[PDB]
Amino acid sequence: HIDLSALNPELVQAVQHVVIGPSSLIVHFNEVIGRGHFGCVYHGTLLKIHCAVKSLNRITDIGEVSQFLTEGIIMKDFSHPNVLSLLGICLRSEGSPLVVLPYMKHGDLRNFIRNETHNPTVKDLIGFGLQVAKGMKYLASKKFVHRDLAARNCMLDEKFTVKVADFGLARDMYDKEYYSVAKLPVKWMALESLQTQKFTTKSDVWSFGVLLWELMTRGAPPYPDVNTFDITVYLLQGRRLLQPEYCPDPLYEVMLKCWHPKAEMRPSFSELVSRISAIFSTFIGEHY
């Protein structure tokens, strides 16, 4: 039970445009979409917009709630077609605060590409990669470092638009099996992050490379037989993930660039969009 009467009335005024009235949102607590460490996600309907609603169970304090509000306002103004949007936040006199997010029909991108009901083409796969690159170009422009880029942390909507997710108020550990313990996604991490536990846009690029390998393999696990404690040495020896069977040569060249051991020699996300755009354009799709 969070004491809403204690919130500063001026902060409450400043946050209003992120705020969703309890009266405008039905949460279907019956219908669980999924869960992370920080909370369960439920189907909801927003005044009718099908949405995903996440109950942030580790907000207890009034101080915490006030930070949450300010974070919501900040994150609400992020806006790009390949970055997950924050629809709003909802505070309740009982229960944890709620984060309202668009519903993503096709779930996470790793599960989609592993699903036997769908058969994306090589072009579709490259296209997913390009879309992540565009969304990351946007985040990097805002000086926002993801720190956990991976196919499992991108979502797919009904139009097969990819949205970079798992950041801001949606940040969580949703599948613990890919993190080693401070839980680290070691098989996605840049060589220097393994050594220092610091992350930058240049380390996001490295992870993006691994993501592109996940895409082109249709969701193979990276380095499954290299132990967590051996991966730094493996990478120091210059060894990398092998070219996927259906990955075009220039696209594997792009991946190797992303895994350069000198962070400063990796491409920018702008250069990735450029390079992947070109490679994408060499494939004929259904209508163009």
Ligand SMILES: CN1CCN(c2cnc3cc(C(F)(F)F)cc(-c4cccc(O)c4)c3n2)CC1
């Ligand atoms: C059967 N599938 C039907 C679509 N599914 C959807 C649809 N939209 C989601 C939106 C979000 C968002 F971040 F926006 F809150 C989050 C999830 C999601 C949340 C936790 C685990 C997970 O794996 C997925 C969504 N999961 C999954 C299950």
